Structure formats: C-alpha cells, structure tokens
Amino acid sequence: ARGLKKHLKRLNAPSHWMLDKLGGAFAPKPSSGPHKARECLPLILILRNRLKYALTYREVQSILMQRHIMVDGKVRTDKTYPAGFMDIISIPKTGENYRLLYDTKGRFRLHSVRDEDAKFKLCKVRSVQFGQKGIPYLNTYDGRTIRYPDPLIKANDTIKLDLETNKIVDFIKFDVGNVVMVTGGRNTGRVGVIKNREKHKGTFETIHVEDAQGHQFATRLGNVFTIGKGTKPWVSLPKGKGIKLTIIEEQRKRDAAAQAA
Amino acid sequence: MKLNIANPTTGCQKKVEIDDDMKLRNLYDKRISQEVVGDLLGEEFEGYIFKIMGGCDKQGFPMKQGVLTPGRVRLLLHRGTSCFRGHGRRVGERRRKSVRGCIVSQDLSVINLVIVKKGTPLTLQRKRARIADKKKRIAKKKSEAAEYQKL
Amino acid sequence: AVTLRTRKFMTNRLLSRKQFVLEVIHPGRANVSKADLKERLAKIYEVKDSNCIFVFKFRTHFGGGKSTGFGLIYDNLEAAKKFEPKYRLIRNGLATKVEKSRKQIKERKNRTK
RNA sequence: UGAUUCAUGAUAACUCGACGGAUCGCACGGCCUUCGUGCCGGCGACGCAUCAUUCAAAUUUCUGCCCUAUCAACUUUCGAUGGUAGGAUAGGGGCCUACCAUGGUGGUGACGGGUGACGGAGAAUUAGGGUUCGAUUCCGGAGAGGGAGCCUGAGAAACGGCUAC
RNA sequence: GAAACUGCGAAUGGCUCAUUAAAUCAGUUAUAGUUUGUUUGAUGGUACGUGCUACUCGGAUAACCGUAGUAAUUCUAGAGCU
Ligand SMILES: [Mg+2]
Ligand SMILES: [Mg+2]
Ligand SMILES: [Mg+2]
Ligand SMILES: [Mg+2]
Ligand SMILES: [Mg+2]
Ligand SMILES: [Mg+2]
Ligand SMILES: [Mg+2]
Ligand SMILES: [Mg+2]
Ligand SMILES: [Mg+2]
Secondary structure, three states, X not given: OOOOOXXXXXXXOOHHHOOOOOOOOEEOOOOOOOOOOOOOEOHHHHHHHHHOOOOOHHHHHHHHHOOOOEEOXXXXXXXXXXXXXXXXXEEOOOOEEEEEEEOOOOOEEEEEEOOOOOOXXXXXXXXXXXXXXXXXXXXXXXXXXXXXXXXXXXXXXXXXXXXXXOOXXXXXXXXXXXXXXXXXXXXXXXXXXXXXXXXXXXOOOEEEEEOOOOOEEEEEOOOOOOOOOOOOOOOOOOOOOOOOOOHHHHHHHHHHHHHOO | OEEEEEOOOOOOEEEEEOOOHHHXXXXXOOEOOEEEEOOOOOHHHOOOEEEEOOOEEHHHOEEOOOOOOOOEEEEEEEOOOOOOOOOOXXXXXXXXXXXXXXXXXXXXEEEEEEEOOOOOHHHHHHHHHHHHHHHHHHHHHHXXXXXXXXX | OOOOOEEEEEEEOOOOEEEEEEOOEOOOOOOOOHHHHHHHHHHHHXXXXXXXXXXXXXXXXXXXXXXXXXXXXXXXXXXXXXXXXXHHHHHOOOOOOOOOOOOOOOOHHHOOO
C-alpha cells in the first residue's frame, strides 16, 4: 500500500487470541508497543474477553480511563496496548495482580501473584553493547533498556527488574542446565531444563529441552526464555506445571475428573 | 472604474464612481503600490494622496502584484497567498487561477486606493521546577555513573 | 407462581456494578416483563433503589417456560448514570431522545465561513 | 558477530546548525532571609533531538505457473552482460553518465505469440492417481476514463489532492 | 461555550480485476545495503563569557467590524482591531 495498515480484520488476528469468528469483522490490532504484536495480548482482550470486567468496547474504554489499570507498575490509558510475556497487570482498586504467562497450548493465562512476587518483573536481554561516550547498555525483548549493565551480563541472558529502583536486581546467565519456558512455535508453554545447545555457523542455534517428567523437545534460540537457574524457576508457574501432555492423557484426566464426581 | 476610498488614519471607507477620461488618464498605466495625487482625481481631493493598491474587474478576477500585462493570465498559486485563499484545500495544494495584470488599464471594474495624506507566579514556579529537575538529572548522573565506575 | 435464579455472577468494583446472567423459570406463564422482574430483583437484593436495575437480552427458550438474560445492578445511581450506554437509560425512562436530519448535518455548513 | 576498517573512544578541523523549552493545567503548603502570594517545591500535559523498540515498507536469495516450434534464434549504436570512476537515491544496483571490455540467454523451450490469465489460501468431483476451476468478503499486488508530472507530508507519483494533454 | 487560527488524520477503510505468465504471488532468505509519525524505554552541559556558574521580551495574522467585484462557486481585492 502507500502507508501503514491500521485495521486488522478478525480472521487475521493470531490463533492464540481465541477470539471467535462471527463476533464482528475486525480485531483490536495492537498498537506499536513493547511487544511484537504477533506475540502479544491487548488490554481489551484482557478485560472484555477473559476477565469479563466489561461487556463492550466502550466499557473497556471506561475501565481504562478511570485510570484503574496498571502495566509494569505504571498506569496505562491505552486500549490496544501490546502486553506480552511476564507483563504484570495490577488493579489497585481490587488489590489484585496478574502476571501474563503462557500455558502449554500456546495461549495466554493470567497467573495471579502476591505483592512481594509482583514488585518485580522478569525479562531476557536482546543485546548488550555500547552507546554514547562508550557507556555499555542492554536492550531487552521487552523494549526496556538498561544503562551501565553488570559487566557479566551477556546477550540471551535474563534479568529481573524491580518496579521501584527500576534496575537489575539479579541476572541468570543463559546456560545449559537451567529451566526455560519457550514462547513461540508449537512447543510454546512447555517449561523444562536444557540438556544441550547446538550452534550452527550462519543461522539459528537450537536448544534441547526436557519436561521435568521426561518428554524431550527442541527449539531454536529465538523462543527460549530462561526463567530460573537450575531446576527451580523464579516465577510461579501456571495451574499445570508447564507440562504439555498427550491428547490421550487429556482424555484420561477428564475421565478421572468425572469418575470422582 | 469605480473607486474604493479608505483611510487608515481615521478608519473609514466608502465607494464612489468616476467616468472622466481626462480625470483618469493619470489613473491608467500605474501599478499596485503607486501613489497618486488627488489634485486631478477631482477638484475636491486636493492634497489627498491616493495609493493605487488592489483592484479587481468585471468577471471578478483580481489584479495581482508582479504580473505586468493588461491581460487575464492564468497563474499557479499557493493557498493563503495573494489572490489565492482557497479554504478546505488540503495544505500543499496549488491551483491555476485567473488573474489580471498589475498595471491598471481600461477593462477593469473596481480600483482600490487608500489615503496617505489628508490635506506571573505560575511561571515563577515553572522556571525553578525546570531548574530543579535538570539539576537532579546531573546529581543522578554523579551517583549512578561512579557507582559503575568503581567496579 | 414463577421462580428466579442467577448464575455467572460477578461483582466488579471497577464499574461499580454486580452483573449476572439470570435464568428465570416461569412455567405456565407466557413470559415475565422486565418491569415485573424489577421489583422481584429489587426486593431480593434490597438495592434500596429499584431504578439501579437494568435487565435485558431475554430469550424464552424453545418450548416455553424458561427465559434467560443479562442483568446489571448498580450500587450508586450516580455510577448508573455515568457507566451506562445511552439506551438502557432511555428504556427505563431516565432520559429522553431526539431525532436526526443530516442534510447539512455538516456538508453545506462546511462551505460558508 | 559465523564474518566487518564493527559498536564505540580520542584527536584535527568543517557547517552561515535542523537541535539543545520565551509553551499549558489543576492541587495549595512546610517554614521569614527585608515576615514583602515571602525561601520554596510536587503531580501532569505538550514538545524538541539521538539510540533502542514497535507498527511497517522498500529492495532482495533459492525453488515453484497454463497452451504454442505454423514462436530457433533473442539482446547489443540509443545499457544489452560485466569492470572502473562518478552522479542520483533512504539505500544496493546500468538506476544514469564517461571510459574499457564483448559479453548475457537459448532443445532443461530463450525470445515471441495466445489467454474469455491478477497470484495465493482454497472450490467441485474424487477408491488411489488425477481433471477442471479460482472476479469474489482472508492475505499480497495493481487501478482509479487513458496516460504523464508533481506539491503537502513520516508515509501519496495519492485522484472522495493538484498540474497538462 | 459557537466561529476561526495552530496541530493531526484524511496514505486506513471501500470497490473492482483492466494491466501483468519468473513478472505479481507462495514457502523460505537477506539488509553488514536502507527509510520508519507514533507507542514503549533510556538519553540531553558550554547557545558565548575575555568558558572565572546565563546578559531582554517583536509585529501581523485569521475569525470580528466595515467597504466592494462577479452571473457565478469553500471565486476574489482593499481598509480597521487582537
Ligand atoms: Mg486499500
Ligand atoms: Mg490501535
Ligand atoms: Mg558505484
Ligand atoms: Mg483480464
Ligand atoms: Mg483485496
Ligand atoms: Mg467508469
Ligand atoms: Mg494508487
Ligand atoms: Mg493519480
Ligand atoms: Mg469518487
């Protein structure tokens, strides 16, 4: 075309937004923001479709310009804000925190947290390298940038960012043997401990992972997101501890659910 | 032909009509922004200095400064400027309008001439608020740069 | 001799309302008016104001005798004023309506000044 | 970084410097230095420039398209294939110029011709293989009666903008 | 509070399939060969002063008033304010 496309029709809206086919022609079209707009979830889909705090477009507009909604600790009036992975949504009117996490099927869940496990967020680093006058800085995948980074922090690593001092508090060196939570592809959602990492000259370096209950898979370096050093993650995993289970087992669990009821 | 008379000194304006050759042989052949003495424009304009400035004609197409030919030539103008103030025209548009030349001549209608000669506390807050946060910026530097320097 | 029950009920003190999907059962009865449901909902929630209720989207399932729909109970009529779509207010008569004729709603009027 | 005279620093200068805030809101509130709206200082808006990011685009690499040989030679003075030097562009580039070289393609179908041919996801029929279709609501392209040229703008060779035929 | 000036958008949507057969397009590449309003995050010395902690506040302009051309139309000239 001759310029930016600003409508997104409903059937082009990515698969993991779960929004139905016949509810209308268009879809919220996330604004250019901190997350890649293909790996995101707008605030309207958060309020209206999942939490049902509103029932229309305008009602979410009312919610947002009441100034009720918070993202990464600062109030947000936008209504197609591209929230993403481990963005925290607080609603101080309800004293209630969500941290936006995948499940094993590739869809977003709102995993609740307390305040001590909400004061900080967690994100990986895109790259660390120099800037003006030779000061190092790093750029995350969250858009965030940090100046004077801890000279050990490298690319592909992960960091915790407090929402008051607004700098590092710790960083996990991307390495073999610590757990990840893949965020793209068919394996997205599945947590698990790296067992190997193979690099190829000129293209993507892949990571082999194992679900702590045995199953093993692989994914290129793009979608891995180390959570915690070792086996223990530094974030409260969702209802199913990041294990994708065969459809047969999803049948057995529902049989076992009904046979005790 | 028909004269518009206005004065900036008082602020008053009015219009009359003249039809005398020997009265307007001196009116012809003159451009925009040229003084004319009212001596010969009529015996009751003596001392009054009239300024030929403006002037449109029948068919309503004005005279423009700078185009010197008693024709009705088509020019490509810019909105808002002399002899083109088209509204609702999507700034940056140009149109090829019709204009008269700048030397007055026979075929005009109405000639315009003018008369030259008649014979806080909030700011006080904001300035230093700016000074305050610009200086805390540099204090924050002299903390957070050396914090990293010592390592 | 009709019944009245709710489900899918959630209170959001964001928009200061209690919102539910009611599941009315009126065997024998043709159907129940929304007005006629107002006093029953008001006297079972003691909302102190039978005008804070706004109920809609009634169906009367195939075969008759059971109707569903949505319901909205506000806690201050102030919030009912502000967080409401313009037409449920008009349905309850809390405000009135006007009509349009759009020849020079804006078009001819974009020409003069 | 797979790989860079990379990121970046320092230095010598250069520029008639775009830039480095003469902008706008409520909330009042600690305390006299001349008790002087007094010393103050917060929460916001708007905005200017660099970097990163995001929404994009543009250019781009490999492979993939129907019938036709009664379409076996096509391109090359005037860019056709390449080299250098340069201009132009946001940028690579024969995109253009100067000079030099004579190359590029072709029976694995070039070039040309036909298409009642926009491409695709897909539609019908289907035992398997296939045959035919695809204007159409999703994506990509193209176009505003036919062409051509432009201003405003981050973005238009825009037509619910202009200029000419 | 209308009107108007300044800002932004009108380059999205929408319709159609005329053009176009390695071309558009599809899968997949690339940018170390580039531009990107904005959103989000970070960032901001010296303007001259002989670098010895900054040295002062401009009219003209729409809307409005008034006076006109033209047959004319978001066609148009001039005076007067801000
Ligand atoms: Mg379009
Ligand atoms: Mg949007
Ligand atoms: Mg070159
Ligand atoms: Mg055709
Ligand atoms: Mg289309
Ligand atoms: Mg037609
Ligand atoms: Mg076009
Ligand atoms: Mg055009
Ligand atoms: Mg039209």
